[PDB]
Amino acid sequence: GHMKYPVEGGGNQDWWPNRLNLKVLHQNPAVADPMGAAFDYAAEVATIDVDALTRDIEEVMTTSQPWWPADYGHYGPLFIRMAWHAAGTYRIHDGRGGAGGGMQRFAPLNSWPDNASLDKARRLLWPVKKKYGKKLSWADLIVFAGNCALESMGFKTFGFGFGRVDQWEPDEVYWGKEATWLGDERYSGKRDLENPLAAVQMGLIYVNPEGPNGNPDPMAAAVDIRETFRRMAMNDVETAALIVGGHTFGKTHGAGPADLVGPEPEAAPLEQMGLGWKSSYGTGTGKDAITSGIEVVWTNTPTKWDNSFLEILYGYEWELTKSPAGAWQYTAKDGAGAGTIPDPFGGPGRSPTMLATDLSLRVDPIYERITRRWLEHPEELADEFAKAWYKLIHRDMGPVARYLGPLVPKQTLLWQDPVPAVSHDLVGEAEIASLKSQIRASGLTVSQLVSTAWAAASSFRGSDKRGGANGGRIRLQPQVGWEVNDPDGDLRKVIRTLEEIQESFNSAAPGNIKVSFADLVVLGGCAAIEKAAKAAGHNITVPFTPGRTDASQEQTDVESFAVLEPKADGFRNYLGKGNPLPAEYMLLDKANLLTLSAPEMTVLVGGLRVLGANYKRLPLGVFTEASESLTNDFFVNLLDMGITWEPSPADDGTYQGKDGSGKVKWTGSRVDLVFGSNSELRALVEVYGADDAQPKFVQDFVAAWDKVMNLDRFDVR
């Protein structure tokens, strides 16, 4: 092998392949952003003329371009696929993927096999982005064009929201271990897909259209359709609704051999200006277009919304056959419906066709019942598709406070993890002072207050922006019962107390001022930190932002919140079972999800340890003699060359730090020690452990603690 220049590959990771990669904590650096610092997209889009924008998109859709002629003279279907794939990479496990960042325009998504041709699809929309500039992001545009396509072809969508902010660097996400496109090394046991993956192969949006492993078995394809969609937050009814709804439009492309198609976008020549899959088959486009290799046209209404997909799916019997490219697909038996389906450009007319995956909707018992019902009651499909497509394109958007524009529906949706609207005057400076005092007099320890606040706030993840302290869901199922927040003998006592303080406060509250349990949880932690700081001799006030509301069990989808449970949280020195990598890597991943930087992650760990936020109050990493006190003892002791570390005799995970006598003075985990071992983390440790660092430590820690508490507060920004 050979080492390359940094500009052509880089280094370090090359000498230490498994080396922890701290670049995960500084994704999308301000340095790479072309927009100013004062630039706020929300304020730009809120100004856009939606009506004018729709007409412009409608113009592109019906204005074919010679470098990629529009099937049936309408890029509409193409755009629906584009939007479906854009939001289609979403996974419920870590909440990554999705259309929220417009990652389809960057590697590796832009060059995924399943995304072939979408490069022309996006190029076609340049005229629009050009006209609206900064008032419209690609992320919003790539998916609004999909919504627009539907509406111009007869389907009334439920609504739409803008707010997706463009990024300038691709988000590095784990898509699997396969180093070969379409590879598959992600199954164990009885067809069990590895987490967090939500696709059956490397490079696909969901499943193989030719059936599992290319086996045209519709009944088997269904099991995979059911799971990958479930992992993309869609039940049986939504999955069926989505497939039918989409395949009611357009067609597939496979006019010729798939080996006449050149290299993907990221591997193509410069002269191709970012486009990929250049075909040498005939004209290489339009009538001779090759995308998937399949040559299917589901309905006789490619550019119109109607119940044809199902009338056709059930109207004929199917047989297995191949396309010009040699892929599996189905055609009506006995030459039925011959010459019934219109051609995209010329027009010899063709006969019905379906994908193995389309037949799963009729062969599978559950799907069959769903689509049968819609075969007889088409109105029901129209509805389900609306709800499902709305969800599909907005899943990773986060709190509804982020949906901007005149097309956002007013209705509340359970999958949006709803929170009640503020219904009273908010607590002010005086009230916030009083409560902090009432909470310090409640009897709750610093550890309990701090732990409860962290547990509640740290449930947020920047990927799909779900979770957080708003809603006060820490006292509802399933959070009240997570092992990490371990109720065993304390969380329940903290909740009851805060609830009493809320009760007593609201009844005595001044003129129409009331506080929520949700704010109390967070305020409790802020009150505890100020106390601890004083104990350490640092009179400081911890920022607090009121406004959180309390959600009810009924407004909280238990099953949906399952994915937010921490299987690991080094900030609390917690390591559950079944994580992909060792504890330290899991810490960086958590840090990533909380949107923390290396310094912030560092300051938080040290603070949390000495404050007693450790799971089960374990002594790991609690390198301090003090209690209830916010000091920098963690970093000072971590750099103490007087203590000798060795892995503990029994299990690993735990280490022992012996001193001179040979006695054990400290005990720590892989998370604790990595800060003293890693050359880049240590640098950050030598900063907060210096003699002049105590006051800076307290400042940064309080700032970071404040950032976590407000991770989910899009209502005030």
Task: Just list the catalytic residues.
Answer: 85, 298
Distances (CA, A) of 491 to 482, 485, 496, 530, 712: 11, 7, 9, 21, 22
- Say which residues have a Cβ less than 8 Å from residue 657's Cβ, sequence separation at least 6: 643, 644, 645, 664, 665, 666, 667, 668
Give ∠ CA 564-570-574 in degrees, rounded to 5.
75
Closest CB to ligand HEM among 117 and 307?
Answer: 117
Residue 247 annotated as part of some ligand binding site: yes
Q: How far apart are CA 411 and CA 693, in angstroms?
A: 51
Q: Give the binding-site size for ligand HEM (rule: CB under 6 A).
A: 26
Residues 260-279 close enough to bind a copy of itself by CB under 8 A: 265-274
Determine, following the binding rule CB under 6 A, whether residue 84 of this chain makes contact with ligand HEM.
yes
Instruction: From 351-359, 386-394, 466-474, 681-689, give the range in contact with a copy of itself by CB under 8 A.
Output: 681-689
The sheet that has 318-322: what strands, in order across it?
318-322, 328-332, 353-354
In the list 6, 578, 649, 662, the residue contacting a copy of itself (rule: CB under 8 A) is: 6
Which of the stretches 133-141, 334-342, 505-513, 623-631 binds a copy of itself when contact is defined by CB under 8 A?
133-141
Q: Do the beta carbons of residue 234 and residue 288 sit within 8 Å?
A: no
Q: Phi first, then psi: give them for residue 303, nearest 5 degrees.
A: -115, 30
Question: Which one, 430 or 581, has the nearer CB to a copy of itself?
Answer: 581
Give the Cα separation of 463 and 461 in Å (integer): 6
Does residue 291 bind ligand HEM (CB under 6 A)? yes
Q: Is 65 in the site for a copy of itself (CB under 8 A)?
A: yes
Closer residue to ligand HEM, CB minimum distance, 117 or 463: 117
Choice from 145, 327, 588, 611 touching a copy of itself (CB under 8 A): 588
Based on CB atoms, which residue is closest to a copy of itself, 421 or 641?
A: 641
Site residues for a copy of itself, 287-346, by CB under 8 A, read none
CB 528 to a copy of itself: min, Å: 25
**Residues 595 to 614 in contact with a copy of itself, rule: CB under 8 A:** 597-599, 602
294 binds ligand HEM (CB under 6 A): yes
We find the least distance from the C-beta atom of residue 265 to a copy of itself, in angstroms, to be 7
Site mask for a copy of itself (CB under 8 A), range 147-176, x = bound: -------------------x-xxx-xxxxx
Distance in angstroms (rounded) separating the CA atoms of residues 245 and 307: 9
Give the DSSP letter of residue 176.
-
In whole angstroms, what is the distance from residue 673 CA to residue 632 CA? 16
Q: Which is nearer to a copy of itself, 125 or 611 (CB)?
A: 125
Residue 249 contact partner, candidates ligand HEM, a copy of itself, none, CB within 5 to 8 A by sort of partner:
ligand HEM
Calpha distance 272→280 (Å, rounded):
14
Which of 161, 203, 209, 525 binds ligand HEM (CB under 6 A)? It is: 209
CA-CA distance, 252 to 295, in Å (whole number)? 5
Q: Is 250 left (phi over 0), alpha (psi -120 to 50) or beta?
A: left
Q: Is 124 in the site for ligand HEM (CB under 6 A)?
A: no
d(CA 266, CA 291): 17
CA nearest to 468, candidates 576, 563, 594, 574: 594
Interface segment toward ligand HEM; rule CB under 6 A; list 80-88, 130-138, 192-200, 562-570: 80-88
The site partner of 242 among ligand HEM, a copy of itself, none (C-beta below 5 to 8 Å per kind) is ligand HEM
User: Cβ closer to a copy of itself: 413 or 540?
Assistant: 540
Q: Residue 77, interface with ligand HEM (CB under 6 A)?
A: yes
* Residue 313 and residue 325 in contact, taking contact as beta carbons nearer than 8 Å: no
- When asked if residue 111 is in the footprint of a copy of itself (CB under 8 A), the reply is yes
Alpha-carbon gap, residue 392 to 80, rounded angstroms: 12
101-130: buried (b, 16+ CB within 10 Å) or exposed (e) per residue?
bbbbbbebbbbbbbbbbbbbbbebbeebbe
DSSP 694: H
| Contact partner at residue 4 from a copy of itself, ligand HEM, none, CB < 5 to 8 Å by partner kind | a copy of itself
Q: Which DSSP state fits 70?
A: P
Neighbours of 329 (CB within 10 A): 26
Which phi and psi (to 5°) does residue 353 adopt? -150, 155
Nearer to a copy of itself, 168 or 187 (CB): 168
The sign one gets for the Cα dihedral 276, 280, 285, 287 is negative
Residue 655 in the binding site for a copy of itself (CB under 8 A): yes
* Contact status, residue 70 vs residue 64, Cβ threshold 8 Å: yes
Q: Are 566 and 482 in contact (CB under 8 A)?
A: yes
Site string for a copy of itself, 10-29 (x = CB under 8 A): xxxxxxxxxxxxxxxxx--x
Segment contacting ligand HEM by CB under 6 A, of 32-40, 244-252, 649-657, 676-684: 244-252
519 contacts which partner out of a copy of itself, ligand HEM, none, CB within 5 to 8 A by kind? none
CB-count burial class (<10 Å; 0-12, 13-18, 19+) for 322: middle
Give Cβ neighbours of residue 109 (< 8 Å, ≥ 6 apart).
Answer: 89, 103, 115, 170
Beta strands in 279-360 (DSSP E): 318-322, 328-332, 353-354
Residue 245 is a binding residue for ligand HEM (CB under 6 A): yes
206 scored as a contact of ligand HEM (CB under 6 A): yes
Interacting stretch for a copy of itself, rule CB under 8 A, among 5-13, 410-418, 530-538, 560-568?
Answer: 5-13
In the complex, minimum distance from the CB of residue 248 to ligand HEM, in angstroms, rounded to a whole number = 8
Alpha-carbon Rg for the chain in angstroms: 28
Q: Does 249 bind ligand HEM (CB under 6 A)?
A: yes
Task: Indicate whether 434 belongs to the interface with a copy of itself (CB under 8 A).
Answer: no
Read off φ and ψ for residue 332, nearest 5 degrees: -60, 135
Q: Is 212 in the site for ligand HEM (CB under 6 A)?
A: no
Q: Kindly state the smallest distance separating residue 174's Cβ from ligand HEM, in Å.
A: 22
Q: Which stretch binds ligand HEM (CB under 6 A): 247-255, 413-421, 477-485, 504-512?
A: 247-255
Per CB under 6 A, residues contacting ligand HEM are 71, 77-78, 80-81, 84, 117, 206-207, 209, 225, 242-243, 245-247, 249-253, 291-292, 294, 355, 357
Q: Which residues are annotated as a binding site for heme b?
A: 247
Q: Which residues are annotated as a binding site?
A: 247
